[model samples]
Target chain A: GLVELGEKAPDFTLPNQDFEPVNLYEVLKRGRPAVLIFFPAAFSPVCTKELCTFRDKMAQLEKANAEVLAISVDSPWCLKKFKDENRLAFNLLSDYNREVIKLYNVYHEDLKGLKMVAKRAVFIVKPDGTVAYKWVTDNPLNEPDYDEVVREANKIAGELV
Target chain B: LVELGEKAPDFTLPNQDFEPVNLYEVLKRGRPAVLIFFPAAFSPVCTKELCTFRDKMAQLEKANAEVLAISVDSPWCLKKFKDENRLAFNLLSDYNREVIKLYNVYHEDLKGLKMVAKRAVFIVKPDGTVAYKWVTDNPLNEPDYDEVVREANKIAGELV
Candidate 1:
């Protein structure tokens, strides 16, 4: 289940690839919107492609005053390797404890033989800390509609003009 | 408890970086070995113990022992745990907990969590026979590192 639009995106402070904590509200308070991507694992094929898709489309995200914060149950070191291997410039956050995954209502108790991993989901949070748009899928391999997400982000950033 | 002088089970598992590793192939290199079964990656005690082993890896090498740390965490998680801690040796993933079961180190349930590896150690001599074994009931505790090295050194010394 996804958090309803207009709800305040849950605040969290999870570790980044370097094991540094990243706060959700603190980021939104910086006046830039955020794209919160909840992925299952770091190196799995679908996860790698989905995250790299965000990496490849980083310029547009930046143009929309958005930053990518990818979340996964993987450890910080694993995220570091994934980010480096894929040449991702955005931050990859570690939700090892599954706290944020549950807060956003994207947790899958069991998916594809693995236990306690995040489902494939995306939340576009506006600068006000409210979820502007959200999408989640039960299927672990199905990627979100990236085009629709970018359009919504552009609209939120006032770039649709 | 695992038995001494028994043939160690052979299995293929992925290392933390998702590289395939075969036990028999590694043993074929002719080094006495140590296999440490850990409960989970990134947990406090597991991290501390594995990092200590990493720090003391040169001693193990001097004793002619190669070490492999096994856990139930997926390779991706293991990779992250290894990179963050700067561990030097291989961290194998028994994502399905098969190897732990084979070694009789699998805890059916720990606290409330499902199947996971217990904190255990097995020393296999160069001839592929188990020489020393230890298993701990508490997942939060660690195996005796000193005893492990001492046993491996004794086995290697006997071979020399």
Candidate 2:
């Protein structure tokens, strides 16, 4: 599933902050593009800094006609606090059960602890559900290029059928 | 610099065999340690990487080094992972929360969420100094094992 360009994006059903289901099919049918930022956990330094950055730059990113979706393997309760503290308005989904993670092929099972978590990666899904851009971090310490995703959306927004 | 000759910050956690081992204790044994932080155990790439280390265990000893792998998975889960994957090294648990912060490898973006250590490798000298370090952001990718061993060999040779 979590493959490169030209590959079919895996479908998933994950819960939003309120524990409501978010289906990949419905999001695709809405006729708007989306971004899924995969992260390991909430409250961790890198993930918080990044989500806050996204929150701060939401206007600019939305101007490109894309909605941000942050996916993590944390519980809804943890995500609730993170979003609340950061004032993030984007959709924060939980892969806590890891069913969604397995679909996306991003679930990491080697965690020596609970080992029930997802990896940190990012994928840009178009309205058609085709993965348009992808940036999977090779290391957990480094941050993703948020501005580049905005630029890519700008290039494809008008051209998409 | 995040590189060689920097004193590693002290951290303590239980090892795979349920042994409470500290980073300083590894250093006190007269050998630097190879700290490998993987996302989870029993995962594909992680097993491959750890198995590689297992096969090369003798080389590590020859280089005057021991290996310690860290993950967010709990000690119980780690025991299962080691059993299933046949991991023979020190798989330490960050369960009580120590190693992740020391190396600044905690994934900040996913705050409030439970985190295991990310895929990373740190070469610590016997003096408790970090001689080399490598951290991976992508879970699918494996750290450069050859490079880690090479750097470790150089350090061991210099120390002797």
TM-score of chain A of each: 0.84, 0.81
DockQ by candidate, in order: 0.01, 0.01
lDDT of 2 by residue, A1-161 (tens): 44667676777788888898898756755545667788777766443534533223332444455667889888888888887877777778988878876777776676537475667677777666678877775355445566777778756654552
TM-score, cand. 2: 0.44
Q: Which candidate number has the best lDDT? A: 1
Q: On residues B1-160, what C-alpha lDDT tens digit does candidate 1 reach at each position?
A: 3588888988889998788998878878887778888887755333332211123322444345778989999999989987866666788999987899888888888978888899888888766889888888877675556767788788778778
Instruction: Name model 1 segments beyond 4 Å from true.
Output: A1-161, B46-63
* Global CA lDDT computed for model 2: 0.69
Clashes of 1: 2
lDDT tens per residue, model 2, B40-145: 6655332322211122222343345788878887888888877754555677898855678778776654324556567777888888888788876766566666
